[PDB]
Nucleic acid binder design. Structure first.
Ligand SMILES: Nc1ncnc2c1ncn2[C@@H]1O[C@H](COP(=O)(O)OP(=O)(O)O)[C@@H](O)[C@H]1O
Ligand SMILES: Nc1ncnc2c1ncn2[C@@H]1O[C@H](COP(=O)(O)OP(=O)(O)O)[C@@H](O)[C@H]1O
Ligand SMILES: [Mg+2]
Ligand SMILES: [Mg+2]
Lengths: 615, 603
DNA sequence: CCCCCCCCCCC
DNA sequence: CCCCCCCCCC
């Protein structure tokens, strides 16, 4: 055998099984003569035979590929297939429900990819990674973990036959450290890319950097039809395949805006839509507790021939399946913005859009990364509207004016432009992504804030530069707390004083806009109402007192009597619920990390010492 | 800033986790070979900063150490100081006691109270992944902590751990898989081998490797936890390690022998009527729940169906299935008004603690893996349990006095049984054993420190079959056997090696369904290559007729035929468990029957 | 200027 | 014949 017969048979082997051999033959031409590297040429070919056997095993295990006929991606798959075949990067943009997420991996398989390497397929959320993987496996009549596997936090079903591997973008970023060239994959699908989270942008930057060193790798950026040109120019003017099928125009009804109920507008819209022809209603909510209160309210009403279905992140597998079951009458679906573009709620014809969303945004006033509930962008509101366009005569009720909509900015800020650089640097450092200033971002953060973010991380003990940024074990712990680094540092210090509960209450409060209102009209009853929670020692302790006051009285009152209590005590109902959501999410993360949380409230003595760590 | 030395830096390694201490120690050993003292100093100055960094991981873990409490009612809780002192002062301890003592849930706490679990993890093995997850959830609950925190678990497909995990529940197979990336098991300062009396290949492999390992791991402590079945064998293995017997008071159980009268003349009705007669006999006794042992889940379903047709007064029939919901999985520990009859397999013999059981009914059988020399196949027959097992089943109604275990066989039948179950190592074909050791890197089978070595006359035969199948290959000086890609795929199939090769070959041709049909039929006794087609066609016919008529009407069909419904049921049972294993390995199975003679080329 | 591998493996 | 240190690499 010659050097060419062994080099060219590697192109049949797996990607990982071609690296250890192709640059392995170069060692054979080095020790300075043959007749010992002519018998090694014969014996390393035995290993090349056994390698190609696993390729044939994977081929023998590939299922027959089928597609639902009713999906635009199914109908248009030939154009998509030729675009993927002929370009290293393709932007696939299409209306929600076109079949991008469930059919794109199949098209990659039909094209022959996924044998010599895996087709990695990222999602923003673990629930979507798992749910998508079950669905494709089922469409192909396979078991999850066979041809279609998945890898999320706490759950990893990827066998030796797996060709498509669903995962969260977070999961894919964490694998770079161990596999700098991502050699496990021949194809990578970045899905829901229009969310422009830090994770997505981290992947888009890293992949663009990686491409020159991976001529065999193919990239498919999959997203809603929202300024996809930006993805295109980033990947050196990669083609954009717009895969939207037929969509019908949607009627937009504007329903803008002392004892009026907070949810009264939603009740009105619900009753109005109930008078329309059959079709389910999708209601966009700002969070889980808002969805809970709204489901409880709508049930109290006993809407005739109407069933209420709240989409919680904590929904069991039994509940998630009822979303796609046939149902008798009219169904009202309550969801956060996950069903905006990511989820595909079936049977939807009418939408109620309060117009707000929880979004991560750094406050220069408070010096804190926060989660303001602010009006959504036009592009975001148009996605919510678009969910009615699957059929004709869809109705979208917007709980705001037309002037308001026209005024709102066109697009949503990508997370990279609304996050303090300390958080960004910490994640990059934790992921081994390199120096923030040389990273090929799609859109770069403000370079003038890099030094401030580096100093903060040092002052917090998160990194070691006294050049060569390294995480400290404390820093590794901060990077896993999804709140502002300064606030998270305080939480980590509270565990040494047995007041993590209070640290999380205070952190939660500081991560939102002040729930204590003070309108122009009264300006005195609001002040006297909130003075019931002043603490002589610190402004922060007022939040703990207000927190304990709120907890006791959601127990003494019903869900409806509570909302009256909020406007009775000049408290923002939505912000209170958000305060409760964030604390719950934070408490679950903290406890999963083994950080001790005090059961009984720790007195205001040890809370002082722990507070004086942040700044 | 100032001069550092080997002595100073080495003294700081002891503030570190054993992993870090080992690494830095070997890094310092290298610096002893550096001829340039300036270079040594520079390395020291750098290494000292990293030691400072690494020592912080210990402080974070200490900050997460939970407060330890013990249920007052448990014998292990009541003897915790004696247990704690034995663990402290010995490198290996054998903790043996009746089921329900609190060995599984309280031992990991005891190690944490000793101070272990910080510089290394307390690994805790189980034979079943469900047990590993369930125990970790339980201890975490008892400690008022979230699973994945200080108490975590790692099983196939589900890893709930964190940087602060101190106790790590896992299957013994998970621990064995970790050996080839950590030969010293430096992740752990403590390893608890639970249910050790089951004497599976996995357990014996761990006991063998642990015994080899201990001289290289003076900072490691081992706790062998088992039922009270010949624990002196474990003691002798680990150089006469002390045995701490943690049972509470012993409450003798009354044994009634009720050999099955062949009154109906039907083997399946005759057994059901024996269970009915046992249930009657027991309901004439003081209040108490009944635990009926079964050999499979198909048997549980049929027997539970039968007992319900009886219209029993104020009695609930609770079947225990492996795939039970976490809702139905909870009710077994909850209060009930009347009498409850619980049907379970031998998972309820020693591993599980079904509460409130005063009476036991024991048919005396279980599925056991045993290599048949006649057929040259590793079979999974139902066979009479050992005396040790039947006493374990009897023990499960001895929580208080006046327990009654009814044995559906005679005393002579009981005495004819062997004193102990054969350990798996002594009833498994050597080809499977050698394959499994080679996949794990456990070394030559003739030098492995087995608790009980297999008969070495079979070793060369096993190597031959594994060479013929293409699972292994010998190399440079015929000193170590090495695995091939095919053999690794064979390592993952819990069936006979020759049958396993067939399953993989069926994957090429889309007839893994048929390969499983043949495989499960060969691992049992028939209800009756051209012979294998009879297996498939019988299977297909039975499946169709099973969906055609009711469950009751289907039993009438088997008896109006030269077919035994019991063997049919065990065939379907084995197949189902086989299909579950195949699916978890990502091997595709055809839905429709493979077309004719598509299997010929696969045999 | 320290640590470890193959028949994809480590101090 | 083939690679590595922030526990990495043909
Ligand atoms: N798990 C599921 N069960 C039933 N139907 C589903 C499931 N997932 C997706 N679908 C349906 O398949 C269609 C395609 O959805 P998807 O592939 O997510 O499209 P896109 O990613 O373009 O929004 C949708 O209309 C949806 O209703
Ligand atoms: N999952 C569980 N739910 C509720 N109680 C349990 C659970 N597991 C164990 N227990 C209680 O703890 C006791 C101790 O059981 P265990 O620690 O498994 O003892 P052993 O391992 O010695 O059989 C049991 O008898 C039971 O009362
Ligand atoms: Mg999608
Ligand atoms: Mg136990």
């Amino acid at each position: 055998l010659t050097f060419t017969a062994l080099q060219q048979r590697l192109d049949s082997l797996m990607l990982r099984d071609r690296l250890r051999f192709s640059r392995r033959l170069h060692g054979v031409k080095k020790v300075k003569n043959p007749d010992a590297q002519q018998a090694i040429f014969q014996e390393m070919a035995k290993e090349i035979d056994q390698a190609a056997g696993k390729v044939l095993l994977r081929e023998a295990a590939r299922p027959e590929i089928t597609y639902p006929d009713n999906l635009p991606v199914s109908q248009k798959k030939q154009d998509i297939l030729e675009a993927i075949r002929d370009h290293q990067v393709v932007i696939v943009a299409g209306e929600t429900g076109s079949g991008k997420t469930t059919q794109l991996p199949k098209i990659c398989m039909e094209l022959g990819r996924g044998i010599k390497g895996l087709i990695g397929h990222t999602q923003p959320r673990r629930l979507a990674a798992r749910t998508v993987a079950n669905r494709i496996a089922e469409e192909l009549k396979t078991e999850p973990g066979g041809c279609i596997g998945y890898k999320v936090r706490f759950s990893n079903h990827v066998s030796d036959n797996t060709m498509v591997k669903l995962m969260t973008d977070g999961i894919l970023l964490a694998e770079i450290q161990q596999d700098r060239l991502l050699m496990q994959y021949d194809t990578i699908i970045i899905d829901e890319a229009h969310e422009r989270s830090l994770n997505i942008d981290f992947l888009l930057g890293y992949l663009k950097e990686l491409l020159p060193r991976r001529p065999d790798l193919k990239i498919i950026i999959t997203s809603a039809t929202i300024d996809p040109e930006r993805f295109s120019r980033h990947f050196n003017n990669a083609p954009i395949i717009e895969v939207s099928g037929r969509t019908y125009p949607v009627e937009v009804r504007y329903r803008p805006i002392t004892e009026r109920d907070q949810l009264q507008a939603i009740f009105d819209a619900v009753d109005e839509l109930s008078q329309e022809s059959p079709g389910d209603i999708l209601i966009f909510m700002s969070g889980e507790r808002e969805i809970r209160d709204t489901a409880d309210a709508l049930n109290k009403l006993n809407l005739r021939h109407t069933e209420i279905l709240p989409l919680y992140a904590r929904l069991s597998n039994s509940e998630q399946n009822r979303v796609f079951q046939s149902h008798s009458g009219r169904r009202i679906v309550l969801a956060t913005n996950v069903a905006e573009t990511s989820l595909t709620v079936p049977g939807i014809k009418y939408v109620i859009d309060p117009g707000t969303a929880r979004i991560s945004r750094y406050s220069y006033r408070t010096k804190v990364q926060r989660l303001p509930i602010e009006p959504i962008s036009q592009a975001s509101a148009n996605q919510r509207k678009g969910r009615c366009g699957r059929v004709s005569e869809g109705i979208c009720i917007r709980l705001y004016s037309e002037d308001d909509f026209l005024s709102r900015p066109e697009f949503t800020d990508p997370e990279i432009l609304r996050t303090n650089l300390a958080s960004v640097i910490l994640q990059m450092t934790a992921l081994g992504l390199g120096d923030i200033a040389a990273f090929p971002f799609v859109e770069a953060p403000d370079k003038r804030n890099i030094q401030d973010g580096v100093r903060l991380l040092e002052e917090l003990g998160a990194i070691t530069t006294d050049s060569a940024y390294k995480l400290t074990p404390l820093g590794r712990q901060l990077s896993q707390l999804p709140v502002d680094p300064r606030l998270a540092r305080m939480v980590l210090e509270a565990q040494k004083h047995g007041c993590v509960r209070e640290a999380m209450i205070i952190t939660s409060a500081l991560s939102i806009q002040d729930p204590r209102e003070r309108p122009m009209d009264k300006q005195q009853a609001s002040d006297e109402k909130h003075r019931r929670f002043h603490d002589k020692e610190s402004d922060f302790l007022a939040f703990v007192n207000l927190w304990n006051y709120l907890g006791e009285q959601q127990k003494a009152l019903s869900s409806n009597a509570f909302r009256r209590l909020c406007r009775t005590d000049y408290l923002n109902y939505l912000r209170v619920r958000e305060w409760q959501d964030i604390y719950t999410q934070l408490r679950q993360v903290v406890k999963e990390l083994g950080i001790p949380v005090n059961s009984e409230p720790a007195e205001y003595r040890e809370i002082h010492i722990a507070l004086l760590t942040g700044l």
